[PDB]
Design a protein around this ligand. Structure first.
Ligand SMILES: CO[C@@H]1[C@@H](OC(N)=O)[C@@H](O)[C@H](Oc2ccc3c(O)c(NC(=O)c4ccc(O)c(CC=C(C)C)c4)c(=O)oc3c2C)OC1(C)C
Length: 187
């Protein structure tokens, strides 16, 4: 309720500017993984009902119990790095899927509140993190619709700034017209 009561301090504004900042924070975490030498592919998806899906082929947010807290690391990071917690707090629903240790780990949240303990929901050969979120309509009272062009412009800049990372943007809001933009700069 720290981020919810005063959302201005944590993200900036609750307008369209603050709405797209939700996406930048989540993507910045995937770019960090790529800069460390552990990811090379990031995918930003605008899904039905303006849900956002950000996927990377990183190491997967660790799932091991943190000795002090007594909870998995993914839970800790997302419910306070600071940025992911704020996005979680400002979202009416947030889902995380971690692909690590040949297992698929899942946790869902509501307004930053864990709905259930981290559960194992599958098996994998791949590593990476999938973060799905729906912005809180009660917080973002102006608009809850992402402007594709605003997303495309910053994604193009980030792929250019961070050479060698493939960043893809896909709009799937209307199944009748699916637009996609793939960026990858060697230079
Ligand atoms: C929001 O989570 C972000 C990550 O987001 C994404 N997209 O992967 C990413 O930006 C970055 O990811 C890191 C940052 C550091 C390590 C890292 O130092 C690792 N080394 C380990 O073997 C390890 C194993 C277990 C463990 O709990 C920790 C420390 C825990 C951390 C950093 C959450 C480290 C590792 O496996 O994964 C790491 C990962 C995936 O830091 C987070 C967790 C805040």
């Amino acid at each position: 309720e720290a981020a919810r009561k005063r959302p201005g301090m944590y993200i900036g504004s609750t307008s369209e500017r603050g709405l797209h900042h939700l996406v930048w924070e989540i993507v910045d975490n995937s770019i960090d993984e790529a800069l460390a030498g552990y990811a090379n592919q990031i995918e930003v998806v605008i899904e039905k009902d303006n849900w956002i899906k950000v996927t990377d082929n990183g190491r997967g947010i660790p799932v091991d119990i943190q000795e002090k807290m007594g909870r998995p690391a993914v839970e800790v990071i997302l419910t306070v790095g600071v940025g992911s917690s704020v996005v979680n707090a400002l979202s009416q629903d947030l889902e995380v899927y971690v692909h690590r240790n040949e297992t698929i780990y899942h946790q869902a949240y509501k307004k930053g509140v864990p709905q259930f303990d981290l559960k194992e929901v599958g098996t994998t050969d791949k590593t990476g993190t999938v973060i799905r979120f729906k912005a809180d309509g009660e917080i973002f009272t102006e608009t809850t619709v992402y402007n594709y062009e605003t997303l495309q412009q910053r994604i193009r800049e980030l792929a250019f700034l961070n050479k060698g990372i493939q960043i893809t943007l896909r709009d799937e809001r209307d199944e009748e017209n699916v637009r996609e933009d793939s960026y990858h700069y060697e230079g």
